[PDB]
């Protein structure tokens, strides 16, 4: 009936009642925790499956606006039911769509940026029918979100799933990523994470510049048709050349990154409806770029390069040359974005804000599901306040969800 | 049967050992509690002296496990041990472990410690039977020998000293210190805190028991030892047994002038060791430090020594905003310094890269021969530079195997004085 979480640095204790509203698996059992497991078409919901999911969401939406039990609430409910009876599915109103998209972000236990959840620009693209249409919608998203460096968070929602045979999909995992090319000598040019997607693009006819920071083309699928290539207009892709405020040589590494993090491979679930193409964007925390993108061994792997220029002893790990070069890379990233007036947040500010957000969510909502394994930044963990903050993890809906990669299930026409 | 995947190597391991899990983790299908410090209160035995139907099944299970370990099970010595444990509980409401059973159980408690990154060495543990102990003086003698053996003039060795098991609950043996060696914390009149803030309350009890504090920043605390439920007694560990390392920096000549030191021997002394239903309330165990425990947590936690600003100021760092990452930069230098100092003084220490790499290897070993290895991601990943260590990218399954080390309440919330 109640659960308590404690911050071990501050002694603050919060009481989670909201977890009673969750209704879907975490992956754990009573005797084994799967808290660190990353992921613990005909599966479209039947009529009888969809009825209670829509009732739940419509009830939740009318509760949120202090109209529960109202005439408008009850008529909406039977209107939804009629659609499900006739058409085996239903259509959200614009208000419900905006509410669902904002709450799916609010409910994202792994996102540390949720203090901003209520300031989200929703772009209703449910009238889209072609890949060309999707490209137009996505170009307008990118230009709005980027806002000349003064980033604004936003989502564009494409038509919901029907029978699973007519999905809309953004095949890109983000709207802006760099290409990756495996060389014959075993080495990799560009971003090793995107090698397979780069190969899918090329075979579809993309002519790659074969460089280190080639912005990839969009690969867009509408209504279950084969996906199509489109080149984002270069003037819409804002990029930051990475330099260091004290190390003159750092600009000579030749590094840049894009300004706009825009995840496009997830699935938005509102009231049992599945929005298979729903790309969303915000702004970066510095460590996403500085620690993971640049320094993962499977990613750009520049630690060794930077330590060399730093003149560090790299013969023994206990010199902490890796830790040292990592801090400088992350200083360079934050300094570069700030100098070019492109929105960014360091891990300290971001985690402190999330703690403020968590306490408020407990205050007014009864809790706030949170995934410690993801909330804690990938460097300097215990000197950030979330490290010392107990967190409960559960799955509320609307939610953002993973889905399989399109090329693992699409059958080509 | 569950799989775990490492996302750096794509190695996938397959866990069947979790089918032997006994106690609740705290999680359910609908709520994960994997970042709660004490998620469960599910114990294997009720409050005080258990009835025969309560203790015997736990006993039978441990003995079954142990004889299974040595390729008996059903052997003559196994069936006689069952009858011996049964007659013993019938006649005393408890039973006593053979020497071999005690050693097997302590080593497997360590092997089962999901939060411990050090378990590659689990089977190389020195076990000191102190179950004949009767007084706090005896407990001090045993602890001194432990510390001396374990320290080994800086070539540290792993050890545990096991004092008599809990009988009725009003006769517990307890080390009141949380570790055998810690520094005092003193509440200053101006509201600040001198020494280690974590130990302010234990330091007060010591002072309140007659300890004369030297009132410094690194005052080794006295032992506060409780035998057979009686009042605890203060003892000063002979200083020549308390190895300490003065912290200096391989490049910053000014670092030594910060006047920082730490001790060499981490010896956890407030935990409970549970073997076949038996509860060893006093079982101090020790190994050697991972550098980050001292340099990240002990020195840089806000509720601890909090030395970040002072090191950052000495380094001439832009301390007016977070985004300069001055905290992160000082943090790295401190950990370079702690490591360099322990190594210069030839005192055993391991950095977080070496230690996490070893644990991945231990994991591969455990799955290969045991069918799994319980591990708590939240505690295994180091508190700096997490994602540049291999355990960050390693999925882990957490579950509670027995024998185990458990938490227990601080004795001063529970003890009736006399
Ligand atoms: C406004 C600034 C934002 C910041 C600073 C931020 C920060 C982060 C970070 C650091 C992660 C982990 C990413 C990783 O480590 O790979 C994350 C995850 C996530 N973000 Fe946010 N985020 C922001 C905005 C948004 C928005 C606008 C949405 C949706 C409308 C969103 C939805 C999510 C989701 C669903 C995840 C987790 C995906 C998963 O489960 O893997 N975020 N966020
Ligand atoms: C020999 C080298 C060892 C290393 C490097 C090591 C490392 C660690 C570290 C870093 C932690 C986390 C502590 C914290 O962050 O507060 C830990 C936890 C733990 N260690 Fe080990 N350890 C070692 C030996 C041992 C031994 C000999 C035992 C018992 C016989 C043991 C039992 C435990 C237990 C039970 C925990 C969890 C304590 C808790 O749940 O609060 N360790 N270890
Ligand atoms: C809006 C937003 C802001 C921000 N700073 N960051 C992200 C983000 C989120 C993921 C999570 N992401 C899910 C898809 C996946 F493919 F499953 C892999 C994990 C990954 C990233 F690279 C990201 F930049 C998103
Ligand atoms: C043998 C050993 C080696 C090593 N390198 N480290 C530790 C250790 C373990 C904790 C865990 N500790 C338990 C008591 C508690 F009260 F439960 C709070 C958590 C704390 C430390 F400071 C520690 F040095 C132990
Ligand atoms: C194995 C582990 O689950 C995996 O590395 C997780 C850990 N925590 C993370 N946290 C964030 N923010 N992003 C990640 O990709 C991961 N990866
Ligand atoms: C809230 C969180 O569970 C708590 O701060 C944990 C996190 N992980 C940890 N990991 C280690 N090794 N030691 C700790 O004390 C903690 N503290
Ligand atoms: Zn769990």
Burial (0-12, 13-18, 19+ Cβ within 10 Å), B392 = buried
Q: What is d(CA A300, CA A292) in angstroms, rounded to the nearest whole number?
A: 9
Q: What is d(CA B243, CA B346) in angstroms, rounded to the nearest whole number?
A: 11
Are A90 and A80 contacting, i.e. CB atoms less than 8 angstroms apart?
yes
Inter-chain touch B398–A35, beta carbons under 8 Å:
yes
Are A382 and B384 contacting, i.e. CB atoms less than 8 angstroms apart?
yes
Whether A2 maps to a domain, the answer reads no
Query: Quick one: B70 and B153 in the same domain?
Result: no
DSSP state of B222: P
User: Given B7, B34, B329, which is nearest A33 (Cβ)?
Assistant: B34
Query: Containing domain of residue B162, as a range?
Result: 15-131+158-168+272-286+356-380
Q: Is B8 on the interface with A (CB under 8 A)?
A: yes
Q: What is d(CA B211, CA B235) in angstroms, rounded to the nearest whole number?
A: 9
Query: Quick one: A274 and A313 in the same domain?
Result: no
List, in sequence order, the alpha helices (H) in B135-198. Answer: 136-151
* DSSP track, B282-319: ---EE---BHHIIIIIIHH-TTTT--HHHHHHHHT---
A281 three-class SS: strand
Nearest to B291 by CA among B255, B332, B241: B332
Query: Quick one: B324 and B276 in the same domain?
Result: no
Does A266 sit in the ligand 3 pocket, CB within 6 Å? yes
Whether B394 maps to a domain, the answer reads no
Q: What is d(CA A370, CA A353) in angstroms, rounded to the nearest whole number?
A: 14
Does A299 sit in the ligand 5 pocket, CB within 6 Å? no
Evaluate the CA torsion angle B56, B57, B58, B62 in order and state its sign.
Answer: positive
Q: What is d(CA B319, CA A67) in angstroms, rounded to the nearest whole number?
A: 50
Query: Quick one: B30 and B123 in the same domain?
Result: yes
Q: What is d(CA A80, CA A61) in angstroms, rounded to the nearest whole number?
A: 13
User: Given A34, A324, A348, which is nearest B322 (Cβ)?
Assistant: A348
Of these residues, A105, A111, A161, A169, which one is catalytic?
A: A111
How many CB atoms are closer than 10 A to CB B168?
11
Residue with CA at minimum distance from ligand 5 atom 5: B393
Nearest to A117 by CA among A149, A154, A144, A147: A154
Helix axes A47-64, A71-87, angle to 10 degrees: 160
Cα separation of the two ends of chain A:
53
Are B108 and B131 contacting, i.e. CB atoms less than 8 angstroms apart?
no
Inter-chain touch A326–B30, beta carbons under 8 Å:
no
CA distances (Å), A53 to each of A50, A106, A108, in order?
5, 19, 19
* DSSP track, A37-90: -S-----PPPHHHHHHHHHHHHHHHHHHTT-TT-HHHHHHHHHHHHHHHHHSS-
Evaluate the CA torsion angle B208, B209, B213, B217 in order and state its sign.
Answer: negative
Query: Quick one: B145 and B227 in the same domain?
Result: yes
Angle at A74 between CA A70 and CA A79, to 5 degrees: 145
Kind of pairing between the strands at B126-129 and B159-162: parallel
Residue listed under structure tokens 């901003």: A116
Kind of pairing between the strands at A180-182 and A188-190: antiparallel
Kind of pairing between the strands at B12-15 and B2-5: antiparallel
Whether A382 maps to a domain, the answer reads no
Nearest to A17 by CA among A29, A4, A30: A4
| Paired strand residues for B274 | B279, B404
Q: What is d(CA B72, CA A338) in angstroms, rounded to the nearest whole number?
A: 69
Query: Quick one: A272 and A305 in the same domain?
Result: no
Burial (0-12, 13-18, 19+ Cβ within 10 Å), A381 = buried
Q: What is d(CA B378, CA B386) in angstroms, rounded to the nearest whole number?
A: 11
B385 annotated to bind ligand: no
Angle at B251 between CA B249 and CA B254, to 5 degrees: 65
Residue with CA at minimum distance from ligand 6 atom 11: B379
Q: In ligand 1, which atom is closest to the CA atom of A292? A: 15
Whether B153 maps to a domain, the answer reads yes
Are A267 and A278 contacting, i.e. CB atoms less than 8 angstroms apart?
yes
Are B231 and B278 contacting, i.e. CB atoms less than 8 angstroms apart?
no
Q: What is d(CA B384, CA B335) in angstroms, rounded to the nearest whole number?
A: 10
Residue listed under structure tokens 């600009």: A251
- Residues of B in Cβ contact (< 8 Å) with A25: 29-30
List, in sequence order, the alpha helices (H) in A340-397. Answer: 347-365, 372-375
Tokens of B7: 């996302």
Burial (0-12, 13-18, 19+ Cβ within 10 Å), B35 = buried
- Residues of B in Cβ contact (< 8 Å) with A387: 383
What contacts B1, CB < 8 A, 6 or more positions away? B14, B15, B16
Whether A176 maps to a domain, the answer reads yes
Residue listed under structure tokens 């097997």: B104
Nearest to B246 by CA among B260, B235, B234, B233: B260
- How many structural domains compose chain B? 3
Query: Quick one: B114 and B188 in the same domain?
Result: no
Whether A96 maps to a domain, the answer reads yes
Nearest to B219 by CA among B232, B200, B247: B200
Distance of CA B353 to the CA centre of its chain: 20
């Amino acid at each position: 009936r109640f659960l308590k979480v404690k911050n071990w640095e501050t002694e603050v204790v919060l009481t989670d009642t909201l977890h009673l509203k969750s209704t879907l698996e975490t992956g754990c059992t009573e005797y084994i925790c799967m808290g660190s497991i990353m992921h613990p078409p005909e599966d479209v919901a039947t009529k009888d499956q969809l009825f209670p999911l829509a009732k739940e969401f419509i009830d939740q939406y009318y509760s949120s606006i202090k109209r529960f039990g109202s005439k408008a609430h009850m008529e909406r409910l039977e209107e939804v039911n009629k659609e499900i009876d006739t058409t085996s599915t239903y259509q959200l109103k614009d208000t419900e769509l905006i509410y669902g998209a904002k709450h799916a972000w609010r409910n994202a236990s792994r996102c540390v940026g949720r203090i901003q959840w209520s300031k989200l620009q929703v772009f209703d693209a449910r009238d889209c029918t072609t890949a060309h249409g999707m490209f137009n919608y996505i170009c307008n998203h990118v230009k709005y979100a980027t806002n000349k460096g003064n980033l604004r968070s936003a989502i564009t929602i494409f038509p919901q799933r029907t029978d699973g045979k007519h999905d809309f999909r953004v095949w890109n995992s983000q709207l802006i990523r760099y290409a990756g090319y495996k060389q014959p000598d075993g080495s990799t040019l560009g971003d090793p994470a995107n090698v397979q997607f780069t190969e899918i693009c090329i075979q579809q006819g993309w002519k790659p510049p074969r460089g280190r920071f080639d912005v990839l083309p969009l690969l867009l699928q509408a209504n279950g048709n084969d996906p199509e290539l489109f080149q984002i207009p270069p003037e819409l892709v804002l990029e930051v050349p990475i330099r260091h405020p004290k190390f003159e040589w750092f600009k000579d590494l030749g590094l840049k990154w894009y300004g706009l993090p825009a995840v496009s491979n997830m699935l938005l679930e509102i009231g049992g409806l599945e929005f298979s193409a729903c790309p969303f964007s915000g702004w970066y925390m510095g460590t996403e770029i500085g620690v993971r993108d640049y320094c993962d061994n499977s990613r750009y792997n520049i630690l060794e390069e930077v330590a060399k220029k730093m003149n560090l002893d790299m013969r023994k790990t206990s010199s902490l040359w890796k830790d040292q070069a990592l801090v400088e890379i992350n200083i360079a990233v934050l300094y570069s974005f700030q100098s070019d007036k492109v929105t960014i947040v360091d891990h300290h500010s971001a985690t402190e804000s999330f703690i403020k957000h968590m306490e408020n969510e407990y205050r007014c909502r009864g809790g706030c599901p949170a995934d410690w394994v993801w909330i804690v930044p990938p460097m300097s963990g215990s000197i950030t306040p979330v490290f010392h903050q107990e967190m409960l993890n559960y799955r509320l809906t609307p939610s953002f969800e993973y889905q399989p990669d399109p090329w693992n299930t699409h059958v080509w026409k």
